[PDB]
């Protein structure tokens, strides 16, 4: 079966608390990313579509490696991340870059998709559409 999707607990963008068991009983769209990489804002607009809508069975998150890597700090994420007109995407905070390293990310965008008992379910590297998503989501329990 479908290996476990390594925990976290992290800090969001906006002062929440994020744990991934938690949402055990929802499927999980997982993305890693960073501000520098082209490919990764690319990809983002098609996300805050992907968030609108409103019937999903599964919750997004994302997450950076503020300091670290090129990324910016905290202090100015959540500022740079609304002036390029992003919205409603959720980012989480992986401080000492220990989410990165759990789950072996070597390249950014990835992207992990998780079935709601936690298993991983597909994983991509760079591009995914919405419709790819949701159908791979289809398949899951």
């Given at each position: ?9 992290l ?14 009983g ?29 019937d999903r069975?599964?919750?997004?998150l994302?997450?950076?490696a ?6 910016k ?22 401080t ?11 390249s950014?965008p ?11 379910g597909?994983?991509?590297?760079g591009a995914?559409?919405?419709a790819?998503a ?8």
């Amino acid at each position: 079966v479908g290996k476990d999707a390594p925990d976290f607990t992290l800090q969001s963008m906006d002062g929440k608390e994020v744990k991934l068991s938690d949402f055990k009983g929802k499927k999980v769209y997982l993305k890693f990313w960073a501000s520098w990489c082209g490919p990764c804002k690319k990809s983002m607009p098609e996300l805050m579509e992907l968030a609108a809508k409103p019937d999903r069975d599964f919750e997004i998150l994302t997450v950076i490696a503020p300091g670290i890597q090129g990324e910016k700090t905290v202090e100015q994420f959540p500022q740079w991340f609304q002036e390029q007109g992003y919205k409603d995407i959720p980012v989480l905070y992986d401080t000492k870059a220990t989410t990165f390293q759990a789950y072996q990310i070597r390249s950014i965008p990835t992207e992990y998709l998780i079935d709601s008992q936690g298993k991983i379910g597909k994983i991509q590297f760079g591009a995914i559409s919405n419709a790819d998503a949701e159908a791979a989501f289809k398949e899951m329990n």
